[PDB]
């Protein structure tokens, strides 16, 4: 059973909008409030500005609390600002930002003053999703309530989404321009862009059926003896010292939810092993068979002869086998 999440790289475009209210006393200055908000970056700004020009506006316009709010960095006019790489941190993914210092209002004697700092931040984050893959979470602990595989093509629009359809924009034929090398990639990809209330996430879209794999290749057994006894099949491997018991009937692979991956991986590994070890002495006997073993193990088996819909739940304990 594939307990590992489906992992993929995403990019969070958002503007950190910090409004600080400062009170200036006679001999001191005190913060009377620091409103920090995260604004999504619009699609017209991710495609036209960030991806093409490598810049970002000095304003954030976003819907917060059922209001259209527009925040101007340093309270001055909107200007395009270059994205510079973030300060290096250990074990940290790449990130870029426009502004590096928090703007706070200039001193005036005995007056509360409000000062806005809009920092356009672009972070490459790891995003992960679990079955039924109707939601995925970014590395920043933010949940995104859309299937990773939501899109436009060939039934990839019936995938779950919890946002209005005006918040999603799959820019087909997307040319990624790295913000460090400033080099535009040649091979196009389908770019999904979801503008959540707090940020915008972009990820390269892939079809769901060949991208997920509800089973995971756990062991590749060169020599797995199969025997029939007591109306059941025993698959014994001396290499890993493990014996599984299955019903005599084959397991219909169509019954595995999201299961096109199992056949492909099994055939690839099986052909590789056959080429490596059994090409010169044995011959394959029929097409790969699939059996379900107690504990929830899916054994793909290729018999050899010498020339002479549901989810499978797998136990965490192999020591029974």
């Amino acid at each position, epitope marked *: 059973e594939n307990i590992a999440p489906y992992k993929f790289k995403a990019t969070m475009y958002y503007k950190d909008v910090t409004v600080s209210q400062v009170w200036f006393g006679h001999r001191y200055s005190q913060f009377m409030g620091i409103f920090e908000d995260r604004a999504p970056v619009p699609f017209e700004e991710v495609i036209d500005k960030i991806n093409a020009k490598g810049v970002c506006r000095s304003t954030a316009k976003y819907v917060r609390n059922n209001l259209e709010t527009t925040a101007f960095h340093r309270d001055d006019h909107e200007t395009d600002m270059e994205l510079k790489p973030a300060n290096a941190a250990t074990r940290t993914s790449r990130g870029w930002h426009t502004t590096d210092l928090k703007y706070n209002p200039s001193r005036v004697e005995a007056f509360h003053r409000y000062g806005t700092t809009v920092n356009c931040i672009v972070e490459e984050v790891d995003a992960r999703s679990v079955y039924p893959y109707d939601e995925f979470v970014l590395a920043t602990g933010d949940f995104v309530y859309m299937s990773p595989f939501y899109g436009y*093509r*060939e039934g990839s629009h019936t995938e779950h989404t919890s946002y209005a359809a*005006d918040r999603f924009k799959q820019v*087909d034929g997307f040319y990624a321009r790295d913000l460090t090398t400033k080099a535009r990639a040649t091979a196009p990809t389908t770019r999904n862009l979801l503008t959540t209330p707090k940020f915008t996430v972009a990820w*390269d879209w892939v079809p769901k059926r060949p991208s997920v794999c509800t089973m995971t290749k756990w062991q590749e057994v060169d020599e797995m003896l199969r025997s029939e006894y007591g109306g059941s099949f025993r698959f014994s491997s001396d290499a890993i010292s493990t014996t599984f018991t299955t019903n005599l009937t084959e397991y219909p692979l169509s019954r595995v939810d999201l299961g096109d991956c199992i056949g492909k991986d099994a055939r690839d590994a099986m052909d590789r092993i056959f080429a490596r070890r059994y090409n010169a002495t044995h011959i394959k006997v029929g097409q790969p068979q699939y059996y379900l073993a107690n504990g929830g193990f899916l054994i793909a088996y290729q018999p050899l002869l010498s020339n002479t819909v549901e989810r499978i739940k797998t136990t965490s304990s192999i020591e029974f086998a």
Partner: antibody
Amino acid sequence: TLKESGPALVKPTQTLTLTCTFSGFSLSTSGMSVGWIRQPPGKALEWLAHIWWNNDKYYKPALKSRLTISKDTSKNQVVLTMTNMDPVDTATYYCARIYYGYRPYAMDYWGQGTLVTVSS
Amino acid sequence: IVMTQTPLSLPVTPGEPASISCRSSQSIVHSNGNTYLEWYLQKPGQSPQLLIYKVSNRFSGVPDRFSGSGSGTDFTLKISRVEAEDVGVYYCFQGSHVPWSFGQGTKLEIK
């Protein structure tokens, strides 16, 4: 079925608005797309624009600054707008339906097309 | 992706096979792993109709005479037995990557 409709004569340097009426689909289903294509007389097919059910407009980059496709599902229509018309823009415009939502082939159902001449 | 259809005019006697080739500046292979190339046929005073989709698949309403092939940036429509009804202009259209475009088209003539 789709039916394109627009002024048959627009003078140069003006905006032309067209309209495509549908039948058998509304542009609010999960995967429906509607596209506009022109064809100058005697020339090959030139794609212009296409809009998905979620107001996701795609244009021709050459004509992107001039083309504006909008979708009004209340009247079940798509309006294609193209400003600063030039005599080169004289063409027959076709409204098509795209099954990329559902099938791997686009532009199955075309309208009869409307012929527009750009002249004063 | 730029589609150039060759030739621009293909006169073929009825009964003989015909081949039409059109190339794309870059690969039309999509991230899906499927190539979205469609062939269209515009007849005189008629709206175009799809003939071949996904390179090697024929749309319903199209006779077995038409057959598509090719890969990468080279694609070829092929009519095993050209008939009189095949008169018209043929277009190859890439749908994989935005923006989409048609080829320059080939006019089939019957000799």
